[PDB]
Amino acid sequence: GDVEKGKKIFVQKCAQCHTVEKGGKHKTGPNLHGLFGRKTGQAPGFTYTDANKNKGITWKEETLMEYLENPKKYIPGTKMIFAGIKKKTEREDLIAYLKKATNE
Amino acid sequence: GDVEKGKKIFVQKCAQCHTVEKGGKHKTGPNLHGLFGRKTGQAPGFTYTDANKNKGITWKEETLMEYLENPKKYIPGTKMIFAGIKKKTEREDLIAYLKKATNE
Amino acid sequence: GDVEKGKKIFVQKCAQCHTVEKGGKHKTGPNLHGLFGRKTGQAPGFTYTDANKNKGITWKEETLMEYLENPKKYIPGTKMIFAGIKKKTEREDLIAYLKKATNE
Ligand code: HEC
Ligand code: HEC
Numbered sequence: 001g002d003v004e005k006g007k008k009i010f011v012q013k014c015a016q017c018h019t020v021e022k023g024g025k026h027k028t029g030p031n032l033h034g035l036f037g038r039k040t041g042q043a044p045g046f047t048y049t050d051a052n053k054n055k056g057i058t059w060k061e062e063t064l065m066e067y068l069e070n071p072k073k074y075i076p077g078t079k080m081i082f083a084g085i086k087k088k089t090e091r092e093d094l095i096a097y098l099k100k101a102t103n104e
Numbered sequence: 105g106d107v108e109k110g111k112k113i114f115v116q117k118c119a120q121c122h123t124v125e126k127g128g129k130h131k132t133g134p135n136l137h138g139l140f141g142r143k144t145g146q147a148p149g150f151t152y153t154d155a156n157k158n159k160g161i162t163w164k165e166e167t168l169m170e171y172l173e174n175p176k177k178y179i180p181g182t183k184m185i186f187a188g189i190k191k192k193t194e195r196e197d198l199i200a201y202l203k204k205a206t207n208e
Numbered sequence: 209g210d211v212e213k214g215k216k217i218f219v220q221k222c223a224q225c226h227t228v229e230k231g232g233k234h235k236t237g238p239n240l241h242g243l244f245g246r247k248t249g250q251a252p253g254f255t256y257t258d259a260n261k262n263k264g265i266t267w268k269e270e271t272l273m274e275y276l277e278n279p280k281k282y283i284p285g286t287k288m289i290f291a292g293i294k295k296k297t298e299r300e301d302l303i304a305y306l307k308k309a310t311n312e
């Protein structure tokens with residue numbers, strides 16, 4: 001595989017939601033560092049859909065090749081954009097900030 | 105709730121689509137200034153889905169807690185990304201612009 | 209139509225995914241230069257959905273007016289955000305890059 005071309009593909013189609021560096025930050029999507037040889041939905045600090053959290057497979061060339069071809073087909077129920085916040089604590093904190101920030 | 109903590113959440117999951125400050129601009133989503141105590145779909149100058157426009161509830165701790173847990177469940181039909189432009193005149197202006205810029 | 213207003217509409221609701229200038233880059237969506245008088249899904253260098261690729265209509269005021277009011281109704285199956293990579297080649301390159309970058 002051509003790593004050089006890979007980078008460019010990532011910048012145009014993935015970077016908007018993903019970071020790859022170690023210690024990288026979470027955005028719309030989880031940080032991808034340490035992806036290979038690891039099971040789906042295990043990036044620390046990120047809240048996945050139950051589907052991505054339980055797909056159960058290990059990310060590698062074969063699995064990635066099939067997933068990236070059609071994510072929704074490989075993992076029915078996965079969501080690429082905001083679909084809500086599960087943790088009650090998280091929602092509470094967000095709402096606290098909102099009651100303050102939107103009340104200038 | 106924790107205001108600080110909530111800000112990091114907003115920045116990571118909401119900022120790309122929402123502004124909170126008074127007079128702040130609409131983006132993909134409506135500016136959220138004066139959210140609390142206001143009825144759904146009432147931000148001046150933003151075109152909501154008929155669903156969000158007519159949900160008929162008032163934004164507050166409880167209503168927001170349920171909505172943020174699962175947006176589309178609370179307001180079936182709500183759209184997070186471009187789903188079209190209702191106003192005929194707006195589509196006309198936009199098209200006149202494209203007619204100019206894409207042929208230049 | 210009012211081009212000046214049209215430019216404002218495009219900046220707020222289209223710019224994030226589309227460029228218009230000749231030689232413009234492809235982002236989430238395809239560069240739109242040369243849109244008028246061309247068949248759907250004909251932008252060089254962009255991988256459209258089979259739906260957008262074969263809608264078979266010519267982009268003109270009449271067609272755009274309908275499309276812009278409700279895209280998915282006009283072209284069912286069309287996707288506005290990442291829905292997968294068709295070409296096995298790109299997937300291999302992307303995966304080769306990830307293999308390196310995510311392993312820092
Ligand atoms: C935002 C609009 C995204 C774009 C564009 C891309 N991805 Fe993504 N990805 C996104 C989210 C929110 C999620 C999780 C969804 C869920 O169901 O919880 C993901 C997840 C992945 C994963 C799996 C990670 C894991 O299981 O730990 C991979 C491997 C992945 N995304 C890859 C990927 C690539 C390579 C992209 C560009 C081609 C890409 N994504 C774009 C959000 C978004
Ligand atoms: C990203 C979040 C987008 C936004 C916002 C807008 N568009 Fe888009 N558009 C996007 C994609 C990914 C695609 C292709 C979808 C597919 O099925 O492959 C498109 C396509 C168009 C087209 C047709 C291009 C062609 O036939 O060659 C047009 C005419 C178009 N989009 C226009 C457009 C305008 C004017 C927008 C704002 C009002 C707009 N798009 C937003 C992604 C996104």
Ligand code: HEC
Pocket residue numbers: 082085094114117118119120121122132133134139143144145146147151152153155156157172181182183184185
């Ligand atoms: C991307 C686009 C987003 C993201 C990532 C978030 N929201 Fe927001 N939001 C968006 C839109 C286009 C709409 C309106 C949808 C429709 O018309 O059906 C909204 C609306 C809200 C609302 C209700 C506003 C109102 O009734 O006046 C709220 C309270 C809201 N969104 C909040 C919100 C928060 C706190 C987010 C982060 C967790 C968030 N959104 C993300 C679009 C988008």
